[PDB]
Symmetry: D3
Subunit: 312 residues, 6 copies
Amino acid sequence: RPLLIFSGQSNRPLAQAIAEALGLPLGKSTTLRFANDNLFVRYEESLREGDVFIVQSFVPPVQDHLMELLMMVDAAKGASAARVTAVIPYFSYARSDKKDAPRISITARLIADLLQTAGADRVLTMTLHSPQVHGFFKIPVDHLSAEPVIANYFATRVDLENAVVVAPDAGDLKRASALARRLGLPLAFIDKERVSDTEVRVRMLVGEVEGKTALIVDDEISTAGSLVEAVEALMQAGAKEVYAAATHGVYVGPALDRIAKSPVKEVAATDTCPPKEGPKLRTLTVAPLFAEAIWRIHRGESVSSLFTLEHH
Amino acid sequence: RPLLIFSGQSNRPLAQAIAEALGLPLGKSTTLRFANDNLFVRYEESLREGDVFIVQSFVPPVQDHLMELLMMVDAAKGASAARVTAVIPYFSYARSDKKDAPRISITARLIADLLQTAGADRVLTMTLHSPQVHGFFKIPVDHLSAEPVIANYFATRVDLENAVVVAPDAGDLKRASALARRLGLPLAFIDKERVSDTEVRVRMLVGEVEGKTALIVDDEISTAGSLVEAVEALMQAGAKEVYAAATHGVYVGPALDRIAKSPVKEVAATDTCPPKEGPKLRTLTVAPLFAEAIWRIHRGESVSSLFT
Amino acid sequence: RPLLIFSGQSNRPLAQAIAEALGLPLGKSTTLRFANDNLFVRYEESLREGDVFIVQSFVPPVQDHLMELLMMVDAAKGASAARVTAVIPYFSYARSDKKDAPRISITARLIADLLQTAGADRVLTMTLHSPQVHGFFKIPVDHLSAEPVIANYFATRVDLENAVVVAPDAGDLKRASALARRLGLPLAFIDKERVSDTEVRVRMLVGEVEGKTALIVDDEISTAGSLVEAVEALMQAGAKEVYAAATHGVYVGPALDRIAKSPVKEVAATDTCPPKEGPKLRTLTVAPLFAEAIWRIHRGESVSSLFT
Amino acid sequence: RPLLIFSGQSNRPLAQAIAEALGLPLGKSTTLRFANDNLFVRYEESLREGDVFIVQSFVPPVQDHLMELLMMVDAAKGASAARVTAVIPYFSYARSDKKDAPRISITARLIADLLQTAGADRVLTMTLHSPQVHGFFKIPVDHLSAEPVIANYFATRVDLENAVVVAPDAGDLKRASALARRLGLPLAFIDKERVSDTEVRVRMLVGEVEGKTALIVDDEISTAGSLVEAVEALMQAGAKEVYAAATHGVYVGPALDRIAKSPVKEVAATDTCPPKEGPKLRTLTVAPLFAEAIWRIHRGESVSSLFTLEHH
Amino acid sequence: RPLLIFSGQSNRPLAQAIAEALGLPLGKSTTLRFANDNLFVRYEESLREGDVFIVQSFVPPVQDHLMELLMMVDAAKGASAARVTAVIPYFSYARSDKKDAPRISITARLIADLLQTAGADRVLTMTLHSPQVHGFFKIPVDHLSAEPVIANYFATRVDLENAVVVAPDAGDLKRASALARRLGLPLAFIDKERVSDTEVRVRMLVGEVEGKTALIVDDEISTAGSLVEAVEALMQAGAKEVYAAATHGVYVGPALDRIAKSPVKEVAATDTCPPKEGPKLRTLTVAPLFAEAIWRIHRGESVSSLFT
Amino acid sequence: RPLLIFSGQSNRPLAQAIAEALGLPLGKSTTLRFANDNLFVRYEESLREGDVFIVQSFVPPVQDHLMELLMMVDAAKGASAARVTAVIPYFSYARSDKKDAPRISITARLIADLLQTAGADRVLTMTLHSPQVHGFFKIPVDHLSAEPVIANYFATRVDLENAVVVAPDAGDLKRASALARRLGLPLAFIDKERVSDTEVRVRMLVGEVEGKTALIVDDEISTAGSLVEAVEALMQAGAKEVYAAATHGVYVGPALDRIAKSPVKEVAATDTCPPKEGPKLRTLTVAPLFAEAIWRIHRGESVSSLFTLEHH
Ligand SMILES: Nc1ncnc2c1ncn2[C@@H]1O[C@H](COP(=O)(O)OP(=O)(O)O)[C@@H](O)[C@H]1O
Ligand SMILES: Nc1ncnc2c1ncn2[C@@H]1O[C@H](COP(=O)(O)OP(=O)(O)O)[C@@H](O)[C@H]1O
Ligand SMILES: Nc1ncnc2c1ncn2[C@@H]1O[C@H](COP(=O)(O)OP(=O)(O)O)[C@@H](O)[C@H]1O
Ligand SMILES: Nc1ncnc2c1ncn2[C@@H]1O[C@H](COP(=O)(O)OP(=O)(O)O)[C@H](O)[C@H]1O
Ligand SMILES: Nc1ncnc2c1ncn2[C@@H]1O[C@H](COP(=O)(O)OP(=O)(O)O)[C@H](O)[C@H]1O
Ligand SMILES: Nc1ncnc2c1ncn2[C@@H]1O[C@H](COP(=O)(O)OP(=O)(O)O)[C@H](O)[C@H]1O
């Protein structure tokens, strides 16, 4: 069973870097859009009895990328692949994980079912918005952590002697605590409120940030709305400075303008989504980690062992 | 089980015309795009134990409309609809009906499976690109015919005395021969072959078109490449004039410019796709026909005594 | 389709209270254990073309109750029920909602699939451990909220003037903030982390509790380890007093001894699980609320105008 | 995973020729019919973890052959085969591919679903009546073409200097055009009408047939009704002579009598269906092509490469 | 949902007798064979939102009848039936119920799955070869008993005073003992073993048959090999006379000649299979019993207060 | 694909003996019960792309053992096992194989469906209560026979010169006849009735038992109700003595007391269920036969060949 890697249109540079890290070419496939906006996929060479891995992130245009992935998985099974894995570095619809209003779609579950119907045997992903999304799949899911790559970034960039990890929202405490333990840093919480959409009010601080290098971490940065509020709150609480990181650098709508305007020193994210150009933006490549996971899925070696427990 | 009608963003005017024909309101549902281009759907009122009909055509943006339909079907079942029908007036991906090259998707079949997985109990549709696409569905499909509205259009709009109906494709003749039979006309057909998405090559023309008014009938008009080449080939062959009709007026890319430029006298299509205004374009509404079919599906009355 | 209600052995008192609220008898069904500890279920009368509701909570013995529910669902479909709803007032395995260690079962999802395979057409439940568990089901779930009965309990039973609602867990805030909002109170939360099945470590306390009457609201109380540690941590932080409420009063192992010993003034829970008598324990019945939801599911009326 | 080949009762000679071309014995299986007309299948030896290929064509008695195939696929999965392929050289029910009347079965789709339920992992077939029938299967389908074998036959039999390929029906133009391009021949069309079921009227001819060796090709010959009409029309249009070929030589009811009575010089068909004895009947064996396809399915080599683009 | 009854080609007389007992017409459907022995089915009128019952027994030609049933079920669902019941008065392949040799089909289970895939929502059947075959179906099965019509036949047709009921097979005793109990008679049984499709070897005879009138009751009579060997073995053992009854009078190959030749006095069977005339053969119609069961399934009334 | 064997809590000694007979360690897995009586399973090491076999018998507590098995099968698929086999040495619910009352569960079929839903690819079992239970599974089932091990036991224990096999119930004749043919013994039948639950009446005897060593065999001994009645009937018919054997020594409720009180010389059963201590109880280990079957399933060798036709 040859190992074969293909890409949709979402993140061909990540797919290419993954193939190169495996010492393999990126498989040849074409995606066309007809004048009627219908899609067409075709594998240019045989992938018969292949262990096929198809890379696609849920970035704009999202529904074209979802359909391209469904059609490439379908076409791979139809062309007699032995096994088909959906490599989905950023699964945006993991945010659609609950029925928080009546009569909506739990779209993360619907998409799991659609991927299974299309013929996916497995999923490989990173930093799901919520860990319960794993249970929306019947097929095996290998869920990679960005914890080691994000902690490495900070360890190489900031003054650890004078640093603190800050959660700006109750939901951020678990991921922030993991980072704090990895860097040997104190953990603080900043309870803030957007009052007049130009001012944010510091209600409560637990821990110390005054004159400290504050670190914030999230699963994703979309519009940078939460990043901006936390940084403003932290400078109002007298932080020296703020470094931010996330797994998914989605960077849509006002994100780039907001980051340029914010006093935030730097914003780092992986390449699960194609990076955008910006003076304070940094990229943390996960091509080598996805390549190692794919190698281990293919050979039946331990993907769980890739979650290291190193302390800086 | 109350009759409930809802619309996606593809063709709200047709859905509204269907609701009005049934004497019902169009049900309230929200579709929005988050900043990250992710879709969100919500039914504003209960549809619990409803006989739910969701109207969506496959028109640009097609993948957004496909996903909005899948999400509306899913959310209707999740909101305890008694039955959910995907009313798909135009199913574009019916053209993806065969494996004409290795290692492609038969995307019509894939989408049938996605619609079933999303929770569709049935489909209502009109003029599938090929009749075999009916077999891509496990759930029941009511497959409506445009033949009555197209027959009526030619019967009253064109001189019939020296007319021939032309099938623009040799593989798909049943439609042209049934229309030819219905208007008491002879039949010609074009043997083409597609060169690109936008260009076709006429390899042969069978039948008598010399000095005749030629009536092209097709399933759809997309780029209008097949239409204007068939008109070029009929005029070159000595046709007096050409008229055309299709169910699906998709009219993308160079279509409206190509039709306006072509010597074709008039082009009729239904409103399965939102009509685009043009001097030589005519709309044949199928709202009443979709309404009558929905009423009949709802009540358990014969749909065949209309359709196909 | 007649409305039919049945009970497993887990919570016959709640099922009986639901039946009485609907003005119906509790349907007759036998469950027995053979000498070899194999289960046997039998419906004593026809439920053919019935709208069948089977009440079972996940309380000890939990695997016997799970299997009795699966077997009652299966036998109801095999006896030609028109529709079968698994009414699961307490779904314990909602706590098994994530893969927080390698090579485990996401048991909430497994059980959703087993319930579907057994033949369940729907689920009715209350206060799932996490809202994402709704997405583990393909069949529709009506997910009832305890917020009205818990709000009413605190509003009338405790002094509100100097009160704060405390979320005993930082990841699950929507419940505490909606209760805080509803009572016009401020909000504190505990950032914990579980050390064992019976012990939790409070890593941080956010909000103002000094000299306040603290209202703990949680989904469930199992061993009461999280409850008494949160009370220890609030009193240590200078709270005047603590009251607590949860939907699911599971009260296993050292719970009743731990609550009686704790300075907590009172602990309210619903009857999703059969109440256990204790001087500081109060029962908030949800029988009327399950009855109203079943009537509405049966008739196709809005459940959301109660729930969630 | 050993390669194992078995046969139902429909076309044991083709199954035997396929096995022999692979250098393999035909696997031992018995099919009994009890006095009550119920069927019984049994594999005489282990096929555990085998790559098992079961040959059955849809020839009379068709429903016994369909049920035998379903039961052999079922029994193979039940006996712990690794993989089961339905080798269906002639899939008669591909003609039942549309709802052309209300309240009928689209029997080609129903049979696809029944084969999948029985436990088929894959299908290997040749010349489906319509190409849309491929999309009635969820399991992979390898669809072989008879184009190269039929074009070879004509290239070895007829005067190519004076030959023309004729389509006698609009539906026949695509297959006829492919043959014409392969043999470097002109393509003609003959519009004819059966008027008084003893006479057929030539309405229109496009291209030339007068004094030419006319070639006609179809997917199948059942009753030879369409073959007879085309040949009569072509001799009325002054053709020298007519050679006919098809993939599936089904040859039911009056076919043999009609062919003997027709001026048609010769009628060639493959052995997807067991050939019938007749003076003007010729057989074009596809045992070697099915054997090559099976070899390539088994080894994960390119079945698509078997579709050659050779011109005579 | 209107009650609609249809027949395959296997047993149109029984279907007609069922329709007449319900006061309904037998619905119109065409089955034809194409020249190439491919089947074709068509419903002549709408059965949309129908409660559809399709009658087919597994009698020669059995594979044609199986396929005609699968195709009628499929086409009924494709024509938007509300519910489709496969009424299978005789399910021959219930005899293929075990893996008694390696690498065979358990064909009863395969056919249950094919019937489900074709779209059957339920089965109505009578006297399955083994009761376990009920477990081969996921969809509900109403399994009718012949015991009332067989009991009544022996009670009025034979002298009971010196009678014994004989089970012709030691593994299948529940039928003979329930009939023995119902007629107030003692019970004997034959321990056989099948040598071929047409021959059985009696290895042991248990019970008192000397000078008695022996009543053989079996599920079916196929070749009559087991019947005439059991009669040979009872007369050899000193029985005065033998009578026999079975549900399914299949009567293939040498059966009618073997019965006529055997000293057996009379052989009764139902019309699950079209009766074959013979001097010693009697028909016990089960049309009224199938009609009553269909009416009850249709209306949601108790079938068990008849069946099994 | 490594061969990997794990155990639930039901019969760890049998699982351990099977692993040892394969020359393999018993895989490490933990099962916890939380205070709320909920179960938790975890595989301590990778079983990725493993051929995994999970041993569990349906012994008390039965529903905890059923759920543990479902959860271990689920978790194995979730941890990316290549193949998962449910090794179920005693399938108690095979007794729940018919609808003998209205509105009950055919629980053997329900459990088959639950095992398939959990992700079982295959079942390996021994002495099903009824052979029709095989057809309740869609997944392959290897059904082992205890016939050779039970016949060996008697051949090593009893005076074959003066022995007879007795069926005490019509349903017992087939299994008793097989034993009789294997030991070259006559077969007798004893028709008895429990009249006053302290007395049993011999209605009929066919064959001879007077002064003979009577052998009785069953699929299982639960409460020993049927064993006791047969032995009492046989001593009333003047048997010298009675030896009993079964596959499944379930031994619940009064079984041990009843066997001690009965004149039965000895009662032998396999270790499909953990043996209970008793003076007249003997164990016939099937660990070596299950190990051989697992070896052959894993390697694709003939499991059917393990059914020997030896005569003593
Ligand atoms: N959904 C689609 N939209 C537009 N073009 C398509 C679509 N699916 C396939 N096609 C293109 O159209 C070609 C088929 O054109 P044609 O020869 O008319 O066959 P068909 O009978 O399916 O229309 C395909 O080979 C492909 O290039
Ligand atoms: N069904 C269950 N019953 C009790 N404890 C469980 C159950 N499932 C998992 N657990 C345990 O509880 C832990 C989760 O506790 P917690 O941190 O509160 O997460 P959650 O949000 O799921 O409660 C798991 O890691 C496991 O040790
Ligand atoms: N559908 C069937 N029709 C006729 N005979 C069958 C059928 N299926 C299996 N058999 C044959 O009958 C034998 C079973 O006969 P028997 O010992 O009576 O067992 P059963 O209890 O299934 O009748 C099988 O071994 C096979 O030879
Ligand atoms: N796929 C999605 N992309 C973007 N926003 C989404 C998506 N799904 C839901 N949302 C919106 O984002 C919010 C979700 O936040 P909530 O579930 O309360 O906490 P969290 O931010 O942790 O997910 C709004 O409730 C919801 O409408
Ligand atoms: N499996 C079959 N075998 C034989 N004839 C069939 C079969 N299925 C359908 N037919 C008949 O053959 C005809 C099909 O022709 P039609 O679909 O119009 O064009 P084509 O001949 O290209 O299939 C009749 O419509 C149909 O009744
Ligand atoms: N899983 C089970 N464990 C124990 N007893 C059971 C089980 N399932 C059914 N029973 C009981 O055991 C009896 C079954 O006997 P029956 O089916 O008549 O013959 P057999 O004893 O051969 O199975 C009672 O009918 C039934 O209630």
